[PDB]
Specification:
The complex is a heterotetramer, with two copies of chain A (122 residues) and two copies of chain B (4 residues).
Chain A: E1 3-4, H1 8-21, E2 28-32, E3 35-39, H2 41-47, H3 49-55, E4 65-67, H4 74-86, E5 88-89, H5 96-106, H6 109-121
Parallel strand pairs in A: 2-4
Antiparallel strand pairs in A: 2-3
Helix pairs in contact in A: 2-3, 4-5, 5-6
Chain B: no helix or strand
Classes of the chains: A alpha+beta (122), B little secondary structure (4).
Bound molecules: the ligand O=C1Cc2cc(Nc3cc(Cl)ncc3Cl)ccc2N1 (2 copies) and chloride ion (CL) (2 copies).
One chloride ion binds next to helix 6 of chain A.
PDB class: transcription
Keywords: transcription factor, radiation damage, ligand, transcription
Assembly: tetrameric
């Protein structure tokens, strides 16, 4: 018999993104080639099958630095990290291949699905 | 607020 | 020119609640009278003006235990913590006064607004 | 997915 506030989840995610932009309570650095990205482990886990596996591991859960596979493109990662914190995906002709490959590696099934759909159309 |  | 995944914020919050139920990456205990509640500091901050103030404080940001005012009812807190992680508020005739008082203390303005509306109707 |  609960009532529901429609905008609550969106407002929570917006505040988590504000914390990210101000570098508040970020507890991990994701290293992609030369580039470094600060984030919240819980948000990464909530969005990605790969980060979920990493941070539920009894040894890796305690690491402050995570290095991604050298094949991962920093721009593709940046676009996906923005999507995690906003629900908005900056998908473009020039980045779609790098975004799909990064989403497959990060195990973000809904992003992989839209990339496959957009590629098929062209 | 809504009835879910 | 971004695209948006409508269900993303809700899915993120659902996974954060799953992490909470399994006590994964919880980094704070909220003490309310004799009762203890484990949570994620970032989620508390995203939902509450009070926790936002507490965890942006350079000294309090590092505390693993937070004790609430002894006037706060554990059940009212529990209902509000559930709302933070689900968007669902278990508002009932027998708990509405304790929920409104706890939401005013936690600075959860949308919950305070619905409690004031529901009280006015009766 | 939608156009926001
Ligand atoms: O495409 C995806 C997105 C995703 C997210 C998560 N994260 C969780 C899943 C569960 Cl059941 N509980 C808690 C968490 Cl944080 C796992 C796999 C995948 N795959
Ligand atoms: O009723 C409310 C809910 C709420 C949430 C937050 N939390 C934030 C606000 C901003 Cl601007 N950036 C980041 C955060 Cl985590 C503050 C005040 C209130 N009042
Ligand atoms: Cl996804
Ligand atoms: Cl609220």
């Amino acid at each position: 018999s609960c009532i529901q506030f429609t905008r609550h989840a969106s407002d929570v995610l917006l505040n988590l993104n504000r914390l990210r932009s101000r570098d508040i309570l970020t507890d991990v650095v994701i290293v992609v080639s030369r580039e470094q990205f600060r984030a919240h482990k819980t948000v990464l886990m909530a969005c990605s099958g790969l980060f979920y596996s990493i941070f539920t591991d009894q040894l890796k859960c305690n690491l402050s630095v995570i290095n991604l596979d050298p094949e991962i493109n920093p721009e593709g990662f940046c676009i996906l990290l923005d999507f995690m914190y906003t629900s908005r995906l900056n998908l473009r002709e020039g980045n779609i291949m790098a975004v799909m490959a990064t989403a497959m590696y990060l195990q973000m099934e809904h992003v992989v699905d839209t990339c496959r759909k957009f590629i098929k159309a062209s | 607020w809504v009835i879910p």
